[PDB]
């Protein structure tokens with residue numbers, strides 16, 4: 001093993017996941033990419049290459065092939081609520097969202113993520129990175145009511161399980177995600193939702209993807225949990241010193 005590390009990214013066809021997948025592919029001088037997606041549809045979307053595997057994270061055996069021989073894992077899966085089809089705006093209410101049965105946050109973000117962490121551990125991974133959301137410090141956060149799923153709570157339960165496991169881990173709680181241009185913004189790291197009290201609380205999906213990558217290259221990023229926000233494009237200078245950035249973080253959770 002003077003070989004480059006094999007990095008598996010799950011949720012590889014998701015919006016943020018497809019960028020990490022693409023970045024790991026471009027970074028051929030640093031990584032060997034691998035990805036896991038939920039559908040053949042998703043596999044073709046990111047390029048149908050042979051390093052992409054199809055499987056459901058809540059079906060334990062089903063994901064084992066993907067995890068074989070991996071050295072690092074980047075978890076980018078998430079439960080996703082869909083608008084329940086009954087809404088009628090013109091006599092004011094507010095849409096209710098739903099999660100397909102067996103696809104709720106408890107099953108996908110907590111148990112599901114537990115599935116992935118447990119398989120990575122069996123396979124001997126060395127570093128696990130997971131992407132989540134800011135807001136977890138407040139159990140009464142409105143997002144937990146979406147689809148009556150408590151999505152932040154189950155995600156944080158999997159973050160604690162990851163931090164507790166002993167495997168080198170980085171937990172990145174992202175602020176509001178943006179389909180905005182990555183690498184063109186000064187990025188900010190916070191602790192325990194403090195950034196929510198600022199105007200720099202959202203972040204380009206491409207910068208969340210690049211932070212996941214860099215976490216893989218610095219000892220500093222290991223055994224760290226931090227929030228991620230940024231400043232708009234055009235106002236300041238885009239982040240470059242990543243060792244410094246991660247050396248700002250001291251929290252293990």
Ligand SMILES: NC(=O)c1ccc[n+]([C@@H]2O[C@H](COP(=O)([O-])OP(=O)(O)OC[C@@H]3O[C@@H](n4cnc5c(N)ncnc54)[C@H](OP(=O)(O)O)[C@@H]3O)[C@@H](O)[C@H]2O)c1
Pocket residue numbers: 011012013014015016017037038039042055056057058076077078079080108112131132133134173174175176177178205
């Ligand atoms: N949206 C925001 O503003 C925001 C803010 C802060 C944090 N975050 C979080 O940051 C992360 C990235 O966000 P994002 O919007 O870019 O994610 P997302 O794209 O929309 O999706 C993750 C996607 O996760 C996969 N997935 C769901 N259930 C699965 C299962 N049972 N097995 C395997 N894969 C499964 C989905 O598969 P399909 O492609 O088949 O659907 C999909 O690839 C998420 O954890 C999200 O909750 C989001």
